[PDB]
Each structure stands twice: as C-alpha cells, then as structure tokens.
C-alpha cells in the first residue's frame, strides 16, 4: 500500500548518531536525539503530504514512600549520590535531599486542576505549574 | 487534596536553567532541556509514589506534493537548503534532497502495521521502524 496516514510510534532507530554525524550535527544535540522516541503523524491525500513529528525522552524516573528516607544516584541529571526523605506538610509533598548541594530538593502541591512544582538548589528556585489533563 | 495521581502537562517553567546550572549541569544539556515542555504521570497509591516525568519539543512539520521539486531548509536538524524532491517507487517513498551532501535522502514504506524509514547522508544509513497507533 502506498497510504501512510496516520500516527507512528517509533520502536526502533539505528545508527542515528552516524547520521546526524554526517550532518555535523552538534554532540551535545547528538547525545539527547539518539535517546528519543519519535512520534510522526501523517495526513495524506493524494499525493499532499503532511508530516509533523515530535521527539520525547524519558525525562527522570523515581519511586519513593512517604517518610521513608532512601538513597538515589541523580542519574539523568547531575548523577549524584543524596539521601532523599520525602514527607506530608499538611497537603504540601516535601522532598529533602541530603548531599552535596545545600538546600536541595523540592516541594509538590495541588490546587484546583493545577499541580504546582517548586524545585530548590543552593539559592536558586525552579517554579513549575502543571495542568491535569 | 493528597491526590497527585494523574497525567500532568506543563504549563509554565521558571529559572529551570538557574536550578540547572546550580546543580553543574553542562551548558549544552541545559540549554535542550529549557527547549522542551514536560508531562509528569504520578501513580500514587497511599504513601507510595511512582512519578514519570518526560520531556518532548515539537520538532519537524513538513508539507510537500509528490513529484513536485521545491527549496526547504532542513530545519529539524542541519538547516542546510537543499533541493527537496519526493516521488513513488512502487510503494516506496523516496525522497532526495539535493545541496551540499551527498547521498542525502530517505525511503519509507509500508509493511502490515509498521512504517518503515531509511534516512541516508554519505555513507551513512539510519533505519527507523514506526508501528501505527
């Protein structure tokens, strides 16, 4: 068949990187494409094509309990060692990890259909909303 | 509420580069990083948590005819103009992109369920499989 429409989930990529490589693709852009998934959406009628397709990578995984301290390797960020104990102030979900850093760790809350991200490091703040969807 | 179960998409993103910077991260990551909006998926069960965070950026829209040539920059990655033509071989999509490299181009077609793409630049070949969603 010569139909493509529709949405494409990549399952498999080889040789990316000799790829970009030729195209003197920069490394660092390198380093973070070849661990993305593709996803491509195709509409197609006759012969007009329209292609758009988005790149995802698997950004940080992690799995805790509440007022349970344990250690974690920041692996997919700065790959450093802390001792991470996350606990309930009122609603407010509080992360405290112990390493390196001072004032390192973050602070999660609800309001309304809106999760609210406050990510600390040192003297810098990270502020992030999310919307339920 | 102490529900953050769910599906959560970004909606805003403050001084993600400084909490960044603050923990060492290289100039480069970062500055991809910044580039993408995020999609948090919390599945919380009690005091246990299990949070999946990913990150996407839009990346390549493309609109083209079949056997109809046209000039395009190859934004999405080298951004180098090139001559861009697309035609049928069969049930093959063969498209060559004519400027500076050599050999530059991709193939795609359908087998059953899955898209298949082969992308082509010196002597370099990438193949890609895409199962349909």
Redesign the interface.
């Known amino acids: ?4 429409n ?11 990187e ?12 390198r ?2 494409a070849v661990r993305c998934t ?3 959406v195709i509409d197609q009628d006759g ?22 301290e344990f250690d974690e390797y ?1 692996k997919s ?2 790959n450093r060692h802390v001792k991470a104990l ?1 606990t ?1 102030e009122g ?1 407010v ?1 509080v992360c405290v990890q112990k390493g390196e ?1 001072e004032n390192r760790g973050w602070k ?1 809350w ?1 309001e309304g259909d ?2 609210y ?1 406050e ?15």
């Open positions: 068949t010569r139909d493509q529709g949405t494409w989930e990549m399952e498999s990529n080889e040789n990316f000799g790829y970009m490589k030729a195209l003197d693709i920069d490394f660092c852009t380093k973070i593709q996803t491509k012969d007009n094509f329209k292609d758009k397709t988005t790149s995802t990578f698997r950004n940080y995984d992690v799995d805790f309990t509440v007022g349970v920041t960020l700065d996350v309930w609603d979900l850093k999660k609800i809106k999760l991200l990510l600390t490091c040192g003297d810098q703040v990270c502020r992030q909303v999310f919307k339920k969807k």
